[model samples]
Target: MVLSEGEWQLVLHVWAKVEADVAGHGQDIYIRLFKSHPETLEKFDRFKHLKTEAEMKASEDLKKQGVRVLTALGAILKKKGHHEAELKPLAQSHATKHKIPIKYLEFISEAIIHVLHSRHPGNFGADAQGAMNKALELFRKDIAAKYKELGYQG
Candidate 1:
């Protein structure tokens, strides 16, 4: 689900506030799960010779989408000068699209924390909360641009 401006902003703020060590945690999973989640990705990966170059490229496209939104979130954090951001709304979109809920988002986030901690214990720390506020503002800009129905053209 493409987030509305308010929703996008809210998600970004949460994301920005995550601990730094969160980076590499499931980076491979995230990259593979760009569009599809773990189950789908695992199934696809299990299919021998199923991943064509085009498929990887499509994954790259997904990565770009993730990056675009994340970048906007970061910019928002910087603008607001807050630490960390909320990624709940973003996760909410994914969860709803996948027939899940906010609970799943929280579950995944906790899982991510554990995954990252296992990868590098005590390395990640608190992030900037202001990031969420900043993301909120930028998400507004993003929605305005995409929501041409509202007369916005990025």
Candidate 2:
């Protein structure tokens, strides 16, 4: 999942363009995720109590969690090719402690792509989408590897 220089540039460019609104965009990603996989809400203590889409949309806790996720993603992208060190601990914690399913990770990735595309209908084209997709696939694989190492059946 090595991204070419151009692909990296394209992804980062679009990322930066939307970075200022991380709370909004990130919230949208999670909202989309829960909409598609409502059962997954059981994993989020902060969001599990929100029974309505309107409540989820307005929850500060959801915004905080969303910011956390997007900020972590920004950190990973900024590290460029040297992300394993940063990702390993996250993978370990999510696998061993959080008990996150691999499919949930896929759901998050898909939600991110969906939010970015819908937010930037004109700007997020094929190239940017491809780059983001490749990068997220790399992230998913890394986490899955850690899950395997920790004997996390999920």
Candidate 3:
């Protein structure tokens, strides 16, 4: 699926919080992620866990891969100065990893809707969607990269 430059920028904004938001809870967000998306469970247990300060302080690890990708997207956009050309490949690659058909792109977008509406209905529509796309990409990319990084393509 193709996304506009505006759309990609919006997503990059939301993905920035992947690490901080999940780690905000006492448990790793992966715990809840797995609960919701059981298909991804057996794949991510290998991560050292995202909840401990000592882990980040002590390890030489890159923080949340999802967040990193979102950050990368920001770099990509800023470097290219808002080219719509690059957005499609990244968005398509994300959906491709899940074997998601183009039809599910709206489903992908709606997942964000569910998050904000379910979590905070007073702030719905474009405001929530635009603001949260960064985190959405971060969350999605995190799931994809970590699991794929661990070597499970399914």
Candidate 4:
């Protein structure tokens, strides 16, 4: 997918700010995910016992997971939307190994966008949000195609 210069610039700008506060941003994503989808904790053995954001923030496991998440995002984003390679292994693992619902991926796409807006308010106008939406749209389609190839129903 081709991203306009402005879109990429908007993404890079937020990414730079968010990277400066890794723990905080990562915490937001995980906290929002668990809050929005409690059942998601079931898949997280390390975090299933965590009942609150405080506990989640204090958890060593959650901390590592959070860093891993951001690192993964950095890998794809740094390549200018070249997620096909990065997402392939991810999709395979989620579809075949984990059998995770596709909505889980969708969950984070929206969650991250929300957190980005919160972290950097007044920076993301409608156009910026639309770029992210477009990026996720392409991302979702790519992931869905891989899932289908793996015979995933979800």
Backbone clashes, candidate 3: 9
**Candidate 4 residue lDDT tens string, 20-74:** 8787788889999889988887887656888888888788778788888888877
Candidate 3 segments exceeding 4 Å error: 17-28, 44-154
Candidates arranged by TM-score, highest first: 2, 4, 3, 1
lDDT of 3 by residue, 44-141 (tens): 34443544445533333323543443345445535323433554455445545535433233343344345444544444457547545544444444
Off by over 4 Å in 1: 1-26, 29-58, 68-100, 125-154
Write candidate 2's Cα lDDT for 25-109 as tens digits: 8789888999998878899776788888899889998999999889898888877667888888888888888889999999889
- Which window of 10 residues has the lowest lDDT sum in candidate 3? 22-31
What residue pairs are clashing in model 3? Answer: 11-133, 11-134, 12-134, 13-134, 14-134, 14-135, 15-134, 15-135, 66-142
Q: Rate the local accuracy (lDDT) of all candidates.
A: 0.39, 0.85, 0.43, 0.80
Assess the local accuracy of residue 148 in candidate 4 as a C-alpha lDDT between 0 and 100: 95
> Candidate 4 local accuracy as lDDT?
0.80
- The CA lDDT at 46 in model 4 is 59
Q: Give me the displacement of residue 99 in model 4, in angstroms.
A: 2.1
